């Protein structure tokens, strides 16, 4: 196709493409048109382009409907869909993350090798909490969401089965 709809920072850009050998010419609704030129090719994690003569360096990643682009402090999913794709995608429900328990349950029946968090400490989403030793293999358990340690009830050398609450969060 030639017609696409680029969906950025919550903004839709119905666009048309025409390309030959040199580069490509993207045209927007308002009649304006940019000229993209690039070395890029699938797989390249970094893209050095030349849009409207001015350098544009991006960090690329694959995503179902396009890619994850990162320019300045920017970092956003850029969906490149076709008009009917886009049209329908708009009928798709808005995903709401799962719920989190404020209780860190032990998922592997092993031995607690170390706890690197104190009571009343504040933790970042995904931060290393403790470390259970499985079968001569270390497993690092981490904060689900940012929160603050209510109470701990296990320490080095401890040996807990599944579900045993390791820590509690307020």
């Amino acid at each position: 196709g030639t017609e696409w709809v680029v969906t950025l920072q919550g903004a839709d850009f119905p666009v048309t493409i025409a390309a030959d050998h040199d580069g490509s010419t993207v045209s927007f609704d308002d009649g304006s048109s940019m000229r993209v030129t690039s070395d890029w090719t699938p797989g390249d994690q970094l893209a050095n382009l030349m849009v409207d003569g001015a350098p544009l360096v991006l960090k690329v990643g694959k995503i179902s409907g396009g890619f994850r682009i990162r320019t300045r402090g920017a970092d956003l999913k850029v969906h490149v869909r076709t008009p009917r794709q886009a049209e329908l995608a708009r009928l798709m429900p808005e995903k709401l993350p799962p719920d989190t328990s404020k209780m860190l349950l032990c998922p592997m029946p092993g031995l607690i090798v170390k706890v690197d968090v104190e009571v009343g400490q504040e933790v970042q989403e995904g931060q290393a909490l403790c470390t259970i030793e499985a079968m001569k293999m270390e497993n690092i358990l981490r904060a689900e969401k940012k929160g603050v340690v209510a109470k701990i009830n296990a320490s080095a050398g401890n040996s807990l089965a599944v579900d045993d609450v390791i820590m509690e969060f307020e």
């Binding site: 196709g1 699938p42 797989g43 994690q45 794709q85 009928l91 079968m135 293999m137």
Partner: protein, 506 residues
């Protein structure tokens, strides 16, 4: 005749605009809209559009909608022919009747005579009760076809609504089952009967929701965020697959180099053996443009199975995950990979097996659960497999598991090893306790006996002396090693003994 145009447009309406909204309300696309996003823009040809059911019981004949609940036909995905059927939930709940199945059978029979995949989009309330045994027979004909086409033409199942009762058994037999995160579900018996019989009360989503199946039951291969990505991701899959069991995996351009070196790899296996590492890093760096379409990601996480391309050709990959259960092999991980292996084989897709398994997971749970049978399945798979098999052992390869992970004894082609590999009967410790009994009461003898076994056997070199490891390579060069290894195997041709079929443990 613009009359034709009318009939056509009428049919396209399904159970009506009011029901279409209903559907959309559930965040669910319509049968037709799903077909629309699946197939190459304007390439869909529909069949049996005005088909009506033949029921006369329960005044069923007063409601004879066109299409009878399912949209069937063909089209292409990136120019390649594909057969499809999307159940239309808005028409009699997309309930299975004699004629609904018949429509599905026509394109299945067509997919088989022409050697092209079949994509099934299930979104049905279940059997059409009023049809009596006719609904059952309808299922039968689909089932039979599903069976005859197993390993003959790819059968990808897409569950995008409800799938209950006998129905579940069809997707069951297809090669893949994808579900849509929250709007879909499947189970043989409904939540209400589970209550009346088990006194247990549970919601459809709890009983057989996308999540329950993508990580507890072992039934689904992935749960997509919604209808749109689900359809997008399925084409992505189809792009890797061969069109049938005669041709080999498809080829396409690739902007990567078979001689790419990843020095980073040289330090992926941590020095401390109790410290994991993510096996997936390796996969990505080996995989072509770093693209890895994983299968059953959220289940049996102690093992990874997926698709990648090398020099633009599809290569299946089975690998151990140290991050979970310490890369152990267990009933579930076995069942998970075993099937993946067999599918790849049946369809001439090569296998790359990345190894780091300690042994199988201990437990009464496992033994009483039948690891003796399930565990065997993965072994059976590699034994049986005849596509090209390349293997790279990154660290641990001990005993039985060592053998099962595409060992040279299962007739794999290339058996590579990282210097950090350790192939042996069992760990130095336990090995020592068996070999040296009268020496335990001397904690320095056994402490030394182990220190020797370790120094003398925990490595890839004794295996090398034997020929079991064709070579020990520098980690950075793995992509280069493996790519050409397969390259040379493109012509591979090996014969298994004649038989109606196998008897693999169930």
């Amino acid at each position: 005749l613009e009359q034709l145009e009318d009939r056509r447009a009428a049919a396209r309406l399904g159970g009506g605009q009011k029901r279409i909204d209903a559907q959309h309300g559930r965040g669910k696309l319509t049968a037709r809209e799903r077909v629309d996003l699946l197939l190459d823009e304007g390439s869909f040809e529909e069949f049996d559009m005005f088909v009506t059911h033949r029921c006369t019981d329960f005044n069923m004949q007063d409601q004879k909608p066109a299409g009878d609940g399912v949209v069937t036909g063909w089209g292409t995905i990136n120019g390649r022919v594909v057969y499809v059927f999307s159940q239309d939930f808005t028409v009699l709940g997309g309930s299975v009747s004699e004629t609904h199945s018949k429509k599905i059978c026509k394109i299945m029979d067509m997919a088989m005579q022409n050697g092209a995949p079949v994509i099934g989009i299930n979104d049905s309330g279940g059997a059409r009760i009023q049809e009596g045994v006719d609904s059952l027979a309808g299922y039968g004909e689909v089932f039979q076809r599903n069976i005859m086409a197993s390993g003959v033409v790819p059968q990808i199942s897409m569950i995008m609504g409800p799938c209950a009762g006998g129905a579940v058994y069809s997707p069951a037999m297809t090669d893949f089952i994808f579900m849509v995160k929250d709007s879909s579900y499947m189970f043989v018996t409904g939540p209400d009967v589970v209550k009346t019989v088990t006194n247990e009360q549970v919601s459809a989503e709890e009983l057989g929701g996308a999540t329950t199946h993508t990580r507890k039951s072992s039934v689904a291969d992935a749960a997509f965020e919604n209808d749109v990505e689900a359809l997008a991701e399925v084409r992505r899959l189809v792009d890797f697959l061969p069109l049938n069991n005669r041709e080999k995996p498809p080829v396409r351009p690739f902007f990567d180099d078979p001689d790419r070196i990843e020095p980073s790899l040289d330090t992926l296996v941590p020095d401390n053996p109790n410290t994991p590492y993510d096996m997936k890093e390796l996969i990505h760096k080996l995989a072509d443009e770093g693209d890895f379409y994983e299968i059953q990601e959220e289940f049996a996480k102690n093992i990874i199975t997926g698709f990648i391309r090398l020099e633009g050709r599809t290569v299946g990959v089975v690998a151990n995950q140290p991050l979970v259960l310490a890369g152990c092999l267990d009933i579930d991980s076995s069942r998970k990979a075993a099937r993946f292996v067999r599918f790849c084989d049946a369809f001439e897709i090569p296998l790359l097996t990345l190894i780091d398994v300690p042994g199988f997971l201990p437990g009464t749970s496992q033994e009483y659960g039948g690891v003796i049978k399930h565990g065997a399945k993965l072994l059976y798979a590699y034994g049986e497999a005849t596509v090209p098999m390349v293997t790279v052992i990154t660290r641990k390869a001990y005993g039985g598991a060592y053998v099962v992970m595409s060992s040279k004894h299962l007739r794999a082609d290339f058996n590579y090893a990282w210097p950090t590999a350790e192939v042996a009967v069992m760990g130095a410790k336990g090995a020592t306790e068996i070999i040296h009994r009268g020496d335990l009461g001397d904690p320095e003898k056994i402490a030394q006996h182990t220190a020797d076994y370790e120094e003398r056997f925990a490595n890839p070199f004794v295996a090398s002396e034997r020929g079991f490891v064709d070579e020990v390579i520098q980690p950075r060069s793995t992509r280069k090693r493996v790519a050409r290894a397969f390259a040379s195997l493109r012509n591979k041709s090996v014969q298994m003994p004649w038989k109606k079929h196998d008897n693999i443990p169930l």
